[PDB]
Design a protein around this ligand. Structure first.
Ligand code: GNP
Ligand code: MG
Length: 167
């Protein structure tokens, strides 16, 4: 069983914790309690192998960007999450992507772009094609739309990072 160091990051309120807790506990967290930093270890199976996932659930609201440097250096795969209902959270993604690539000093890092809250179609402001096209611009990055609430594409976020790391 191999270890995989995964990092969930993105701006405040996008559902990083809701996705992570849905994945780990199978429960949807309705409260919005801002994260400082939480970590989970979970044994899962991907492609018929036991995998030990270390999942870092990070703060969306940081005092300064350099707070993220260490977990970027240590992380092997990154789920960059925005909310399809929150324009600013999509806008914020480029800084985060660039910071990962700078800190890890490389062009190619396992990553998936996640448009969360896809159950809130009435409130959608980020189009699906918009998200797909950003992922494409990011050197054909993986992309999905998820819902922690409706349990859509939650496991797939983490499984896809494992598969990327295995390449
Ligand atoms: N309808 C819906 N609501 C959601 C989804 N994900 C999260 N939420 C809700 O959005 C709010 C913020 O979620 P949360 O997981 O705390 O976001 P976060 O990205 O971890 N915030 P922070 O960066 O401060 O830690 C919560 O009220 C949560 O229930 C989703 O897929 N659909
Ligand atoms: Mg959180």
């Amino acid at each position: 069983m191999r270890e995989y160091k995964l990092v969930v990051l993105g701006s405040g309120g996008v559902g990083k914790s809701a996705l992570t807790v849905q994945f780990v506990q199978g429960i949807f967290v309705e409260k919005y309690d801002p994260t400082i930093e939480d970590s989970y270890r979970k044994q899962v199976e991907v492609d018929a192998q036991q995998c030990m996932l270390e999942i870092l659930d990070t703060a969306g609201t940081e005092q300064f960007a350099a707070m993220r440097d260490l977990y970027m250096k240590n992380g092997q795969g990154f789920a960059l999450v925005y909310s399809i209902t929150a324009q600013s959270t999509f806008n914020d993604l480029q800084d985060l992507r660039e910071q990962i690539l700078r800190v890890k000093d490389t062009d190619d890092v396992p990553m998936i772009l996640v448009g969360n809250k896809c159950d809130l179609e009435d409130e959608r402001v980020v189009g699906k094609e918009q998200g797909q096209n950003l992922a494409r611009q990011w050197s054909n990055c993986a992309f999905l739309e998820s819902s922690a609430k409706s349990k859509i594409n939650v496991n797939e976020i983490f499984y896809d990072l494992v598969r990327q790391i295995n390449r």
